[PDB]
């Protein structure tokens, strides 16, 4: 996966945003940016790639009561355990629309 | 933050997607969905809210060489330490455009 740097140049980081000028298949170049805030996290002072979608390592997702997400998730030891999270923690009703905050 | 469930009903989860019918300010209702894959992660078998943007707890972000993101990040003990991550791990050049994979 990845390896952009092999076919790009003039890469720069400002805040969480990477910008680079990258070679297109047909020759010629394009400049683009990617915001890394959604995919990199700080874990106890170390930059980590954010977990892969929880759907890939959890199964049997259900609404428990009015606001809890329940699932069976794989531990690092590769066994499934019961877990839940209160979606009221961060999911709001903003004028009729569900929004993360 | 959050608290959608107080003014919504017919909430349901299918995979990573919450759908609910929520009260608008002017009365009446709207049905909407939110995909939770970007904001919830599996940490060792427990569902967790994904880290807040790393920009909030890291400072002095820099491109180190051709592909490394370097920063000083806060530990849980609230001290800043040096860290880096190879952006070549997951950032690709797809036909001239930077894309996460």
- Residue ranges covered by each domain of chain B: 1-101
Three-state DSSP at A15 gives coil
Q: Which residues of B, range 52-71, sit inside 8 Å of A by Cβ?
A: 53-55, 57-58, 61-63, 66-67, 69, 71
For residue A93, CA distances in Å to A6, A84, B93, B101 come to 45, 21, 38, 31
The C-alpha atoms of residue A35 and residue A101 are separated, in whole angstroms, by 18
Three-state DSSP at A32 gives strand
Residue B97 tokens read as: 């455009």
- What are residue A49's DSSP bridge partners? A40
Decide if A22 contacts B97 (C-beta within 8 A): yes
State the smallest CA–CA distance between residue B29 and chain A in angstroms: 6
Which residue in the set A22, A51, A93 is minimally distant from B4, CB to CB?
A: A93
Decide if A10 contacts A30 (C-beta within 8 A): no
Resolution in A: 1.9
Antiparallel, parallel or unpaired: β A80-86 and A91-94 = unpaired
Is there a contact between A73 and B46 if contact means CB atoms under 8 Å apart?
A: yes
Structural biology method used: X-ray
The CATH class of B1-101 is mainly beta
Residue B90 tokens read as: 């997951």
- What are residue A64's DSSP bridge partners? A68
The C-alpha atoms of residue A35 and residue B20 are separated, in whole angstroms, by 29
State the smallest CA–CA distance between residue A101 and chain B in angstroms: 7
Is there a contact between B13 and A62 if contact means CB atoms under 8 Å apart?
A: yes
Cα R_g (chain B), whole angstroms: 19
The C-alpha atoms of residue A57 and residue A79 are separated, in whole angstroms, by 10
CB atoms < 10 A from the CB of A94, how many?
15
């Amino acid at each position: 996966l990845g390896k952009f740097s092999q076919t790009c140049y003039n890469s720069a980081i400002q805040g969480s945003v990477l910008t680079s000028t990258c070679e297109r298949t047909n020759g010629g170049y394009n400049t683009s940016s990617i915001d890394l805030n959604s995919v990199i996290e700080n874990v106890d002072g170390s930059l980590k790639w954010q977990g892969s979608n929880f759907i890939e390592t959890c199964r049997n997702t259900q609404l428990a009561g009015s606001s809890e997400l329940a699932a069976e998730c794989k531990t690092r030891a590769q066994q499934f355990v019961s877990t839940k999270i209160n979606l009221d923690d961060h999911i709001a009703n903003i004028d009729g629309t569900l929004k993360y905050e």
